[PDB]
Amino acid sequence: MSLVNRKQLEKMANVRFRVQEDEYVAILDALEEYHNMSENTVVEKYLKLKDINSLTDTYIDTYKKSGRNKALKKFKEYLVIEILELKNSNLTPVEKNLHFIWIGGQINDTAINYINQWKDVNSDYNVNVFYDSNAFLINTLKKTIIESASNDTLESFRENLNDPEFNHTAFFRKRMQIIYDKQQNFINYYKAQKEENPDLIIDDIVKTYLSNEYSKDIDELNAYIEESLNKVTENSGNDVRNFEEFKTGEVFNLYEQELVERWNLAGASDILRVAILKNIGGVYLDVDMLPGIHPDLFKDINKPDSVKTAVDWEEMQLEAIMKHKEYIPEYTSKHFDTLDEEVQSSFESVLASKSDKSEIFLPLGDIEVSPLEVKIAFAKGSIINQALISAKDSYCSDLLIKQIQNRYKILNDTLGPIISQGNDFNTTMNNFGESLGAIANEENISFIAKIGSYLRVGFYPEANTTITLSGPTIYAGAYKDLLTFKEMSIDTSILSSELRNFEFPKVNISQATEQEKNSLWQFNEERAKIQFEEYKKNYFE
Amino acid sequence: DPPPSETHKLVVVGGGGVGKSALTIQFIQSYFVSDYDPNIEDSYTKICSVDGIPARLDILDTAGQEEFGAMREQYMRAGHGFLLVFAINDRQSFNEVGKLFTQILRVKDRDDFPVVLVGNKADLESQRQVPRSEASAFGASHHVAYFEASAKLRLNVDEAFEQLVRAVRKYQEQELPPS
Ligand SMILES: Nc1nc2c(ncn2[C@@H]2O[C@H](COP(=O)(O)OP(=O)(O)O)[C@@H](O)[C@H]2O)c(=O)[nH]1
Ligand SMILES: O=c1ccn([C@@H]2O[C@H](COP(=O)(O)OP(=O)(O)O)[C@@H](O)[C@H]2O)c(=O)[nH]1
Ligand SMILES: OC[C@H]1O[C@H](O)[C@H](O)[C@@H](O)[C@@H]1O
Ligand SMILES: [Mg+2]
Ligand SMILES: [Mn+2]
Ligand SMILES: [N+]
Numbered sequence: 001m002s003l004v005n006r007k008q009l010e011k012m013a014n015v016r017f018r019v020q021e022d023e024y025v026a027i028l029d030a031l032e033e034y035h036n037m038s039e040n041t042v043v044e045k046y047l048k049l050k051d052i053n054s055l056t057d058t059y060i061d062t063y064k065k066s067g068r069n070k071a072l073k074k075f076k077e078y079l080v081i082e083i084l085e086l087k088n089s090n091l092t093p094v095e096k097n098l099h100f101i102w103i104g105g106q107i108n109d110t111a112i113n114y115i116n117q118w119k120d121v122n123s124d125y126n127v128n129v130f131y132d133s134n135a136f137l138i139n140t141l142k143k144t145i146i147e148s149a150s151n152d153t154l155e156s157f158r159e160n161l162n163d164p165e166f167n168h169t170a171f172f173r174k175r176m177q178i179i180y181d182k183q184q185n186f187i188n189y190y191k192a193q194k195e196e197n198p199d200l201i202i203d204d205i206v207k208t209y210l211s212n213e214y215s216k217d218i219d220e221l222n223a224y225i226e227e228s229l230n231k232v233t234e235n236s237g238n239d240v241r242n243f244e245e246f247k248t249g250e251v252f253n254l255y256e257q258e259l260v261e262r263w264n265l266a267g268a269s270d271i272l273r274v275a276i277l278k279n280i281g282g283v284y285l286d287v288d289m290l291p292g293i294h295p296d297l298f299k300d301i302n303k304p305d306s307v308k309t310a311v312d313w314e315e316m317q318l319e320a321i322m323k324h325k326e327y328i329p330e331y332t333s334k335h336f337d338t339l340d341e342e343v344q345s346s347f348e349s350v351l352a353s354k355s356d357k358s359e360i361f362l363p364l365g366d367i368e369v370s371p372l373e374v375k376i377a378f379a380k381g382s383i384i385n386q387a388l389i390s391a392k393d394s395y396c397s398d399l400l401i402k403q404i405q406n407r408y409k410i411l412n413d414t415l416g417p418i419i420s421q422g423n424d425f426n427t428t429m430n431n432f433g434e435s436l437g438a439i440a441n442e443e444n445i446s447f448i449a450k451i452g453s454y455l456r457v458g459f460y461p462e463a464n465t466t467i468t469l470s471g472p473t474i475y476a477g478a479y480k481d482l483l484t485f486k487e488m489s490i491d492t493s494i495l496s497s498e499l500r501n502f503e504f505p506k507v508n509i510s511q512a513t514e515q516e517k518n519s520l521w522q523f524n525e526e527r528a529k530i531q532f533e534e535y536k537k538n539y540f541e
Numbered sequence: 542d543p544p545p546s547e548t549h550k551l552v553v554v555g556g557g558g559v560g561k562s563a564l565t566i567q568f569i570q571s572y573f574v575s576d577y578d579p580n581i582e583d584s585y586t587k588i589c590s591v592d593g594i595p596a597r598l599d600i601l602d603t604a605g606q607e608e609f610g611a612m613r614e615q616y617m618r619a620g621h622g623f624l625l626v627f628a629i630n631d632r633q634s635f636n637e638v639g640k641l642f643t644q645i646l647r648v649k650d651r652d653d654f655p656v657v658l659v660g661n662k663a664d665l666e667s668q669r670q671v672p673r674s675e676a677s678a679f680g681a682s683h684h685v686a687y688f689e690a691s692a693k694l695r696l697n698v699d700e701a702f703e704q705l706v707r708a709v710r711k712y713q714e715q716e717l718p719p720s
């Protein structure tokens with residue numbers, strides 16, 4: 001009923017005195033098949049639209065000047081709309097799992113307190129806090145090697161402190177050269193030790209490395225491992241090392257590349273959350289996300305004129321909830337406190353009148369979704385993978401897996417052999433840049449330009465490569481894939497007009513939280529310059 | 542029956558913190574939020590209408606001052622045209638745009654590649670470090686349009702991007718064989 005039938009397409013693409021070509025009848029037969037697939041899965045109907053589209057391209061490619069092409073190109077558009085009609089019309093229950101991830105170190109009390117808000121008002125959801133029991137020391141290894149590399153760099157600035165050369169850019173660049181040397185020293189140590197004794201777990205190699213090379217005490221380390229393991233298990237800990245579909249899957253080596261080699265826990269977590277959606281299904285949430293505020297809680301308080309965006313208004317309300325209900329101790333109030341007396345009292349009045357936390361934060365209840373799709377959060381009108389919904393084994397969850405494989409294949413195939421010739425950071429980067437230029441074309445040049453900062457990720461201002469390799473960009477890839485009947489699209493040019501079809505409902509989340517503004521993996525120019533003055537002031541004063 | 546939409550690859554370049562992301566996001570989606578820089582997807586696209594002709598714009602923002610020539614080069618291969626952004630309250634960022642102009646010409650191998658110069662943060666007039674006359678003289682001396690813009694107030698944001706489409710179209714028409 002949504003898509004044209006055979007007779008409609010036949011009159012659409014009618015050409016007088018022209019033979020019905022075999023490639024044309026193949027489209028008609030396939031479209032007739034599609035309208036009799038009453039009994040089939042959503043995924044089988046989608047695969048059929050893929051065939052129809054593919055047969056239509058074959059026709060257009062065979063008879064490049066055919067009078068039918070204008071109607072077949074409009075038929076192709078109708079296929080894309082029919083993806084969305086198929087998506088919207090056949091919903092399936094979302095598994096009642098809230099999935100969070102905290103890996104690489106001990107879960108913080110602040111993460112717990114956010115998770116508790118979700119747990120408290122979703123008593124019909126199972127809560128998972130995914131952690132890696134083999135890798136509690138990655139955050140200590142990263143912090144130690146960055147501290148060591150900073151110390152070395154600040155000392156090398158001994159008596160050039162007030163020169164113009166020795167600014168924040170000079171610091172982070174020379175510290176990055178030292179980090180690369182150190183990071184490779186560890187990576188080559190991990191690779192050698194794993195090869196020799198494959199029964200070694202990551203933390204066994206990391207703690208030996210920290211005591212050998214950085215004179216850390218193996219007993220504080222062992223006590224930290226014990227403390228960290230007990231804290232997550234007390235708080236819905238779900239060990240990655242018991243995740244068998246993940247461990248024997250296509251991308252587990254990429255997860256360990258980010259975890260062990262890159263010390264990019266956000267990158268590792270980007271990959272794990274795809275395996276979570278594909279193999280288990282449910283709702284994924286970054287630990288800095290809070291539940292959707294009950295739409296009726298503050299209906300009687302007018303947004304003051306001083307508050308000029310929805311983000312600022314949500315932040316006011318979250319701060320108001322936390323100041324008066326104190327659900328999350330130490331939750332800031334610096335924004336709420338600037339509101340007028342009359343408005344502050346209005347928030348206090350409404351919050352004092354509520355007793356049930358489920359009247360403050362909105363329970364998710366029953367969620368349903370297309371078996372085709374992963375839903376994704378929006379921030380400032382662009383997608384962000386900090387919140388996802390997928391039924392187990394969704395078509396998109398598989399497209400996301402292929403996105404990660406292809407992107408890391410281009411990256412690892414290109415940068416790996418350059419890293420292996422054992423030159424320093426600057427030599428490695430210039431050679432990497434030249435290797436990237438040699439494989440660039442119009443289709444992939446955007447991607448190619450965005451992965452040059454890979455070795456800087458976590459250590460240097462505006463190193464945003466993770467977005468491109470494992471984060472929001474793979475979802476733009478997978479949505480483009482679904483809507484163009486393609487796979488592993490590397491040109492992720494797509495309009496929000498299409499992406500809004502996959503939006504995580506704004507009503508089921510609060511993104512404007514205190515922790516969301518403090519990214520754990522990247523930092524901008526201003527943060528780097530603030531870091532530099534504190535690094536210097538501490539090293540000397 | 543009208544000609545199929547053109548697709549243009551535009552690259553927004555300039556120092557880190559000058560407001561490249563803020564301008565781009567304001568242009569695509571008309572959002573600006575102080576103190577809120579979510580790590581969103583950065584493959585910005587928009588359908589545009591310039592002088593009544595639609596165009597698909599893929600917009601690529603650069604990261605920071607990139608040290609390695611090989612990496613900076615990949616950003617410049619990608620651009621059919623360049624939004625060259627500095628912040629009016631930051632003479633050092635204005636110093637950087639003079640350097641990026643040289644590189645763009647070097648990599649495209651022209652004297653006249655489609656470039657539009659933007660002094661961003663016109664809202665911060667009280668803290669100006671580059672006079673309007675000095676910036677617009679830099680524009681006039683290189684035959685590129687100059688816009689003082691504010692991503693915060695959405696001032697001249699559409700106008701600057703739209704002027705860059707005009708310059709790209711005009712340059713591409715002049716480049717048709719024989720040049
Ligand atoms: N007052 C003002 N601030 C701005 C403007 N544009 C950007 N900013 C701020 O400058 C900072 C850096 O902006 P960003 O877009 O990340 O710059 P980029 O590093 O070039 O992408 C952010 O805090 C922005 O909010 C503007 O037009 N006016
Ligand atoms: O030490 C860390 C740092 C990050 N993460 C994971 O990475 C996610 C993303 O972190 P963040 O919200 O800082 O990324 P952003 O949203 O700023 O890109 C977190 O929710 C965690 O799942 C982690 O497990 N351990
Ligand atoms: O919000 C979740 C985030 O995880 C990491 O930060 C990734 O870099 C990014 O892909 C994503 O924004
Ligand atoms: Mg930016
Ligand atoms: Mn976050
Ligand atoms: N049909």
Ligand SMILES: [N+]
Nearest residue numbers: 051052054055
């Ligand atoms: N097919």
Ligand SMILES: [N+]
Nearest residue numbers: 310311314512
């Ligand atoms: N919001």
Ligand SMILES: [N+]
Nearest residue numbers: 371390391394
């Ligand atoms: N799904």
